Design a protein around this ligand. Structure first.
Ligand SMILES: Nc1nc2c(ncn2[C@@H]2O[C@H](COP(=O)(O)OP(=O)(O)O)[C@@H](O)[C@H]2O)c(=O)[nH]1
Ligand SMILES: Nc1nc2c(ncn2[C@@H]2O[C@H](COP(=O)(O)OP(=O)(O)O)[C@@H](O)[C@H]2O)c(=O)[nH]1
Lengths: 424, 432
């Protein structure tokens, strides 16, 4: 079951690039897309993310879109320039200029060009499972164009799953672009209504990790994106190897998200700074290892992907300790903790783990966005550029509607922490 | 370590329990006297979950056999499997002269033998390095399985409050009038305890098991040993992920959590294929047939908005994960299984190879139509109470001497269960 990856704007294209470089390494594929001599056979399944053009040639099922040339041009001048399908790269002359409404309106104008690439890649798939969107929620392209695409995919491919990797801004990034709470809230509306699973990538927490744990003072996007490609790579493990019948994309979502509307996941990772499976799983629960910055709140579900050689007789003990001890779960159903045992790629130069968690404290992130938006909105601050666009020419009803949809999301999260979430 | 202790009560529980252990011994290469095959590979299974080793190296079922009458337990001790069970785990109390197929008599006798039985249970529990929990084998329509079973469920709740309790509960044949006229009373009183004091209940409907025998094997009035061959096949398959390595999300806790995300709606139905040339049967054939009502061993009536909460399929055969995964993808795409409207479809698959010592499959499912069984018991119980019929032997017992409040409480608790099952079929089950 194929997955098509859509990369939007500076952020989405820059994190997409690291993700595909990482997958190439793992799947024994060269920067030019040619099977490595040592990798003619393997345990891995390339079919999901890569198209097989030849016996020896592999192309990413990836669509690259931006409204500015910079990032796509960097990629086309890199050692990985030949990897991507040149017909899958779209670049618009016309930027989104840090404005959601401009990015969104630009989507409308460039619809047919975008979906000539998407439709072709979809119709070229034997059994398409769904789409992965990589983007920032705070800029102009990843927010506006991303939001346009989410609505369009919902109508054009109603039976396909949409998973996103959505980057939430830093405080430094928030203060630099004053309209970000608007772009963010507007994007959160489509992430709430038009995505099946959203992996929250939080620049605040990612920066904190790079400084406190990796000891990198003043971390660049390149360095931050190393942690990002690690999450994205680790979280697609069960899709990239055979034998995880219960954890194809449909299966992953079902277990992590038994609550359809509460589909925002946070990630944990170890080692960030002799090790057993008990240690790895204990570490994944430590707040300092959790990659979003957020009593009462609880786990809806946990999936630990554990990579490396482990004593599998000890997995029960680790899981059970977590149920009966660090980990607070929903009061209206059983504790849902699952493990997927994996081995590290033999092509790579140790035991590690990724936690994918559905935790209600994620709402505090959306609460913050709502507070920053309210401070601006209730002074009609910085709305002039939005007004110049079609969606906001007459009024800001689209904003008031986004605001209420995100409030309904937040309300459901708090309600999920209580036994009365189910009236029985 | 993740030990499971099995408790077998009454005629039915002991009869199905005995068949279950015969089957486990055969699959794990253990003789009727508990001696493992000479050339057994190490770390190839997880015998330790259901068996322990005696001083002399012979394997012993972690099993407690309880009855208020001698027949079945004496058969087991005159069989070739006489030396299999721990003699200290066999308890027979004949002082009250059996439970007389009456729930009150069985429950009341439980209270009298409490210390003797819990000396046995506590011993097995305390002897476990890391006990997962208990499995009860019994029927609900007799006296010992139902009444003593109900007593033990209440006691386990208080005594081992953190341990899982799973039951394999045999439900009475509804297509026939029984010689036990108090069947509905026995059934409802037990259902109250299965509702409140078990984490998971595997319902084995004699109505459906009989129909298989009558209609497919063409045996008009099948013996218990004929229907128990079906039961042992199902019960042994249903523990496959517990006694073999590589199912880390399907230990007892993980099995229950995935099938029962709704804590109170914890009654499971089972299906199996083949229960009874040209081209080999595929994984797809097996999985498709596990959704056919005739292969599911509860009789719910044919028609509705009843739906699956969860499905597990355990596939046995020499097939590749990708074949099973492609089959699972087609079962989803053909929309054969109707699921809850308030959450995603939950359908899981486990794959296993047949014992060393031909694709087949077991379904374990949480489906809301199970409530129709409880409704039939309520209906039969209501008619009897209105007629004030067959209460004589109940009133002879302490619990029912003054009044029938215990019956009224059971009736309402079971009604609350039924109402939540019907609520589970609606989008508004979650108010968001
Ligand atoms: N983690 C990460 N975040 C980024 C990157 N580039 C941009 N961002 C985030 O996205 C925001 C600006 O979005 P940008 O991608 O430049 O706008 P866009 O091109 O219109 O999507 C910044 O304020 C950061 O929050 C990147 O390479 N990595
Ligand atoms: N499937 C099955 N059902 C049984 C067996 N023995 C009795 N039953 C059923 O169990 C109920 C009566 O319970 P029974 O175990 O005989 O009475 P108890 O000894 O007092 O617990 C009725 O529904 C019988 O049809 C058996 O070996 N197999």
């Amino acid at each position: 079951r194929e997955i098509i990856t859509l990369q939007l704007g500076q952020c989405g294209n820059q994190i997409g690039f690291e993700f595909w470089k990482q997958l190439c390494a793992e799947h024994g594929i060269s920067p030019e897309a040619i099977v490595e001599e040592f990798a003619t056979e393997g345990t891995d399944r390339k079919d999901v993310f890569f198209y097989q053009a030849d016996d020896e040639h592999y192309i990413p099922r990836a669509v690259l879109l931006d409204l500015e040339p910079r990032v796509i041009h960097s990629i086309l001048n890199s050692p990985y320039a030949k990897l991507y399908n040149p017909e899958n790269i779209y670049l618009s002359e016309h930027g989104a200029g840090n404005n959601w409404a401009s990015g969104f309106s630009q989507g409308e104008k460039i619809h047919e060009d975008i979906f000539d690439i998407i439709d072709r890649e979809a119709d070229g798939s034997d059994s398409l499972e769904g789409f992965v969107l990589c983007h920032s929620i705070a800029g102009g392209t990843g927010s506006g164009l991303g939001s346009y695409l989410l609505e369009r995919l919902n109508d054009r491919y109603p039976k396909k799953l949409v998973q996103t990797y959505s980057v939430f801004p830093n405080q430094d990034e928030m203060s630099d672009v004053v309209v970000q709470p608007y772009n963010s809230l507007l994007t959160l509306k489509r992430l709430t209504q038009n995505a099946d699973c959203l992996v929250v990538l939080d620049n605040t927490a990612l920066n904190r990790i790079a400084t406190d744990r990796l000891h990198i003072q003043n971390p660049s996007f390149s360095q931050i994106n190393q942690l990002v490609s690690t999450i994205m790579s680790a979280s697609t493990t069960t899709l990239r190897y055979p034998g995880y019948m219960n954890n194809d994309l449909i299966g992953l979502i079902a277990s992590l998200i038994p609550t359809p509307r509460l589909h925002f996941l946070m990630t944990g990772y170890t080692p960030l700074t002799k090790t057993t499976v008990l240690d790895v799983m204990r570490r994944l629960l430590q707040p300092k290892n959790v990659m979003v910055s957020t009593t009462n709140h609880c786990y809806i579900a946990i999936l630990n992907i554990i990579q490396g050689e482990v004593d599998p007789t000890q997995v029960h003990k680790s899981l059970q300790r977590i149920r009966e001890r660090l980990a607070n779960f929903i009061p209206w159903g059983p504790a849902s903790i699952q493990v997927a045992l994996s081995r590290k790629s033999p092509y790579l130069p140790r035991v590690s783990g990724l936690m994918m968690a559905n935790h209600t404290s994620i709402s505090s992130l959306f609460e913050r966005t709502c507070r920053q938006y309210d401070k601006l909105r209730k002074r009609e601050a910085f709305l002039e550029q939005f007004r110049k666009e079609d969606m906001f020419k007459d009024n800001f009803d689209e904003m008031d509607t986004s605001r209420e949809i995100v409030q309904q999301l937040i309300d459901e999260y708090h309600a999920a922490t209580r036994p009365d979430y189910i009236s029985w």
